[PDB]
Structure formats: structure tokens, C-alpha cells
Amino acid sequence: VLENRAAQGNITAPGGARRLTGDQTAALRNSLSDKPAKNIILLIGDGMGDSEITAARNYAEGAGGFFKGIDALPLTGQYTHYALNKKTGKPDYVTDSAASATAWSTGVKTYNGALGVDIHEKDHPTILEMAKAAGLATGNVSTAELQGATPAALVAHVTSRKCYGPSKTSQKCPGNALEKGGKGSITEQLLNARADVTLGGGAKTFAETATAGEWQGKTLREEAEARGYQLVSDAASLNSVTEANQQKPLLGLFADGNMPVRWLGPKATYHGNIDKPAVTCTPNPQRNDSVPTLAQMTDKAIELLSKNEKGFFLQVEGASIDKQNHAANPCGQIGETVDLDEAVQRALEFAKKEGNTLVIVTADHAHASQIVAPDTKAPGLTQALNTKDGAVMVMSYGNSEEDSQEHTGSQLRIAAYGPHAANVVGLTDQTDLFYTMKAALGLK
């Protein structure tokens, strides 16, 4: 259960590359607790499998380095995230963001594209709903559109993840359409869920007007304001928020769509590791100092949420790891993994002081990127990068001849710290997480 896992010294010498400073038995034994958790923070790196973690550590911290956030959770395991074929109910080996998020939030498998509904299109309550009912405070933060699959899975039960607002719902999720007597689009269901703290992008869908119900005619933003939501749109206004509760829940919309990525780098190309020079990522000029960082949103959320005596449940998502992986952009992808590590550090720092918080870091599924030899002549897209060690690392995306690289179905790392964190050890299924969180918090 050590906190420092960096190489001991000279990696070229006997024992210089070791990460362990001694025997873990006693320490590891001491970190095993079945006492109930008072709080839970689930950090999700979208599409951040072991490959993505390795590539970003190698680049930002060096091969023998270690992420003070992502690599510091003591209890580790691997878990499966296969989805279901809607027709046959047989496993679909490669899941999408929707079905995977639904699994840990509701504890039941589903088909690719569904949010909060099972194979029968039947709704099941999510962990955030159950927590909110027990009286715990709830948060939902992400760097993607708040209507994106991952954050949406905690507050919406819809049949197609594309049903963002009234427009898409009427024609893609007729049965959820508010007019048809349904629960409504993702956005409207998010407004109904009323989590104490909700922060992310996706401001554009709030410009749509409800077709039915009490706030018919008004845009979703107006409905938000009318219902008591405090709205903030930048780092500054977010910083000034001093309270977030059921009487005045917080809703931050920092981008029309997804929030900008931190690093800028060119897209990987065919024979790019041979024909193009090694790259060194630089900061993204399109990102303003007004758009909050994940670490800032996480920090603010934790402070506002920790005021609730009963406890809180918070989910944080580094959304664009997946997105930049689809786009075959190593810098964008690595910058976002680093961005999430800072968020995990904020969470771990709170967890350690408080002493009753279960922190979990994992991904919804694996992705395309592979770390390959400098001289690889690959069929897909590749790029050479200048890492922190002062050495070149080549990354490869070779599973799609299309504009978008794809998810992969490999089991991946799940790590945790705190009460009940032992239930993450060994082989488990993504659905076990739901039950692990429910039992730690003592939910019924």
C-alpha cells in the first residue's frame, strides 16, 4: 500500500528500477476496511485503458515515473465491460460509452446506445438517484457535453444516447418524448434529477424549448433558472459560488459542446513515425483561462458537496481521452489523461484527510492507442513523441480505416482507495461496481 511508486534510482543498475521500497503485506493489510464509506468519488477516464495510462506516464512522467494521482491508489484489479446485443441478448464484446456507464450506474448490462434502461427498455434507478434519496449530496462533473453518455447515465433513462434535447427525442426516442407522455430528453431528465452540483459543457442543448409540460415554450435554460438553478459559465463565476444544495443547485455550462482540450499536437499519420519528426506537445491556444480545468471543477465540487453532513456521491469524467483517441491525436489524448490525474490528486487529498471516502478510478472501456517501437512500419496512423526521459515513444492507432479509431474490448484497470476498496481487487465486472458503491454507502 505504498504511496510512492516511482523508480528507486538509476534504472540501469540492480534494483534501480524497482517501484517497491519493501514488503506491502502489512501496509496492504492495514488499508483493508469494511467500515462504511461516508462519501464516494468515482473518477472515470473515458477510454483510458492500461495502454492509455502507460503512454501518458511515459510521456509526462517518464517510463520510471509515476502519476501522483492515477498511480497512487493501492488496491487494483481488472474488470470486464462487454455490452449486450439488443436482439439476441448475447454479449457484444466491444461496448460504447452509454451501455458501459449504464452498467456501473444501474448494475445491469444493456445494449450499445441505451442510457439507464435495460435490454427491455425498462428503466432502472441510478446510483446518483438512490444517493439523492438517502439524503446524500450529489455531484456530476465532466469535460464533455453534460448530455454525453457518461454524465447522462446518472440522470437519464432514454433508449438512444442521441436524444439530447426535445428535438432529437421526439424523433429518436418517441417513447421518452415529453409530448408522448415520456420522461423527456436527457437534458430535461437532468433538470429533473436536480443534483446539487452539475458542471460541464453542452450549453447549446439548453437553447431548445420544451414542447410540453409546465415550462412549455421556454428554453431549457429558462426552465433551469425558473426552477432555482444557479448558472455559471466560467472559472471566475464558478470560483465565486459559495453554496450548492437542493434549494439552490449549481449548474455550470462552460462550453456550447465539449470543453477544449489542454494540449495541441498534430494528428497521427500513416508512416508518421518514419516520415515526420518527433513531436513535443504544447498548450492549446484555443483554450481560455476562463474555461475551468477538471481539477478546478473537482476541487469546487468537493468543497460545496462536503458541507452535507450525511455525505456525498461525486462522479468526475475526463471525457476527451476517448475523444482524442478516436481522433488519433496523441498530444490531445495525453494532455487529457494528465488533466484527469490532477483531478484524482484533488480527490485523493480529500479522501486522505477525511478518512471515510472511497475513491475509484477506472475507465468505461479500452481504446485504440498502442505503444510501439520507434521503427515500426504500421498500416494505420502513427506518430513519434519526445518524452520526458529525452527518448522517443511511438504511438499507433490501427483498428479503423475510417475517420474515427475505435474502442477495444480488453479488460482494464480499476483502482480504489478507502472503505470497501478491496471489492475492486481481482477480476470483477463493471456491474459489480454499482453494487460495491451501493454497499459502501449503505444504500437500500
Add this chain to the structure above:
Amino acid sequence: VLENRAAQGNITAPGGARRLTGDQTAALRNSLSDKPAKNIILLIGDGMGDSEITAARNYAEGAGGFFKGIDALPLTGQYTHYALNKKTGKPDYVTDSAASATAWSTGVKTYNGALGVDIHEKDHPTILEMAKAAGLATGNVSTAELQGATPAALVAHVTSRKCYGPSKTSQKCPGNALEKGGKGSITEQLLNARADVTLGGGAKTFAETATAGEWQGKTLREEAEARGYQLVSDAASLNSVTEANQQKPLLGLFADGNMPVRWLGPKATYHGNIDKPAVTCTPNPQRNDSVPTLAQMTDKAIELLSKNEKGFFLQVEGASIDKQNHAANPCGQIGETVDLDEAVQRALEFAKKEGNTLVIVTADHAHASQIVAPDTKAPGLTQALNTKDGAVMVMSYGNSEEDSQEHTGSQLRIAAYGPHAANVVGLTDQTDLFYTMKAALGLK
């Protein structure tokens, strides 16, 4: 710390896909022991990363299934296996078989191709050599040529893994070349190391004659006999062996090159998941019934080795997982993963019963195979398979245009059971494995 990790029931229903029957905390806590291990069995799946484990499980046991051997080890973690660039001394992100094996059996990082020597081309003692010095019984078994990087790393100190016998050594490893002061070729050093049990392939190099020393002029096979080794070449004679020790060391050579693979299936092709029907693996008709299986050799070895009162150290290798991954042959690859699982089961059974045996299952490095969506249009080699679920799973190899798919650098799974197994948890380095084993046996 449970033994059954299969999905509980109906994966389409709430909680039907769970692998956990309850809370692991107490069980896990109980499986944490710092008592010294009397024996160690290290099973290595060459190139068996998390993706490889997942594909094989999907195919052979179904997505919700579980490997009775590979998935039954309770303590899990992820470890790094980067090598060193020979010139700069800086990390080389994608290791080879030789450099990786050298790290766990020696405790020092090295460059690609080196066997048992650091970057300064200096020899370091291996855990097998140290075990044998403490009076423990030693075993080395593998399905590849005994001269291959994985088994050789335990008995040879050579500057290039290509120095199989006298010929290649003279030309590629002149400094190790027997006929000028070196300890000899891989085969000559293996013959000098004299482990109690050595089983595998590579009988072809034993046909070479030493160029100097006492047995100059005789084939290496003749030298083996002159030195007291019992030579067995098929299952029946292997099964007939009664004892193996320093007076009568067992040397089993079951093939000229590598042992034949268990299953047969076609090679993945360009758009193979689209232009060709799904495939169903079949037993390899060429595999002679007289050639032992990895589990049979593992089983026989444990039997002979456990006769030493002091204990034993045993390394077992499912070598062709890697070779078939290079060749882009899913059936070949999965068959060898299944093969290794049976070996693991044999190991776990002895371990559970004896109660002072540390079992570790891991891989030397990650590989190329990826599990992708059935409709994937990939730039590399794909193939569709009919899984145990009656569902189609697609595999992809897209990191090389050469005739050999490549290793990848992602951190991968390491799992253990027994005394000191807690040291495998969290993030560690491949070199930490050396120290964990050295400490487990008290082999300082």
C-alpha cells in the same frame, strides 16, 4: 479472494453479470501472508497482456465466463516492463522477450536482445542460480525451444539472445564463445547450470558439436548424457521418470524447434471479418499424441521437484501465445492461452493443498491483438470467430505491415496467490518481481 468469478446468472437482468458473490474485504485480508514461501511457481504467458486474456476468455469460456486457472489468482496489479536503449541508457518503451525475462530473473533492466547481462554487458546471477545455491530444487519448462529468450534467461548470460549454440555464438557473441574464454552458448550454459528439471523444445541445437573444452567434438546431446542427464523425448518416457535431482537431472527435448500449437485456424487477413465467414478453431491434426501438453509437463515437474525438503523454484512458460500473436493467428493464440490456463490450474491445486507455495501468473510484455466491433473495417489483419456465447468476436492485428505483428508497451496484469503475493498489488515494475521472489524464499 473468491474462487468463482463467473457471472452470477442472467447477464440481461440486474445483478446477473456480477462476478462477486459478496464482500471481499475479509477474504482478501485472510489471504495476506508475510510468512516465507517454501516454493515458487512462476507461470509466464509470453505476450499475454490483458487483451490476450480477454480474447481467449471471450472465446473459450464466454464473456461472462472465467478461467479456472488464470482468473483465479486473488491478488492483482499492473506492472511495467520497458527496456533500456543500449547506447543512451534511456528507456526503450517496448521491450523484447530477452530484456524482459532478464529483468524478472535478475532484477536489473537491460537492452533488447541481452540475456542475463546488464547494459554494461556484465553478468548477474539469476533467481534459478540463487535458488540452486540455497539447496532448492529447480525447474524450467516451456513450449518453445529451450534456447528461447524466456527459459534461457534463467541459465545463460549472453550478450545476444541469438547465441543458441557454438556456431552462432562464435560469430555473434565472440566474448561468450567457449573457444575463447566465454561461458559458452545458451545451450552450453544451460547444460552447465544443471537445473533438476528442464523440459521443452529446441533439440535441434543439441545436434551441434562443442568447439572446445572437455566435450569438444561431441554433440551437445552427447555431452548432456556424458554429464548425467536423463534424456526423455516423448510423453511416455517423461511419465516414466521416477526422480530428477543433481545426480540425475531431467532433460526433456520434445521437438526440434518449438512444440506444436494446440489449435488450428486460418491467419487473420485484410478485411477478414468482412470478406470471410467467422471461424471456429479446431484441434491441430499435426500435433502428435506423443508430445506432452504444458499441463502434463507442469504436473510432472511439480511432482519430481516437490521431493526436495527445502523447496523448489519452477518457471513455466506458455511460449506460443506470443509466436501466434506475431503470426496473426487467433486460433493458434487462443489455443495456447487455454493451454497455459490448464498449467495454471495444476499449479494452483498444488499451491492450495501444500499451503506455502507462491504462484504468480503474468506476461513479459503486451502484444498486438485487439478485440474490435464485428463491423470494423480495419487497415490491418482481421478475423471473425464464433465464441462459446454463440456470438461473433472480431480480432485485429494492426501494428505492422511486415510479416510479423509487434509487441506493445502497455503495462499489464500480474496476479498471485500464496505467501508474499501482496507484493504484486498496485503498480510495480518487472524488476520488483525478482526481489519479491528473492524475499519470498529468503534467498538473500
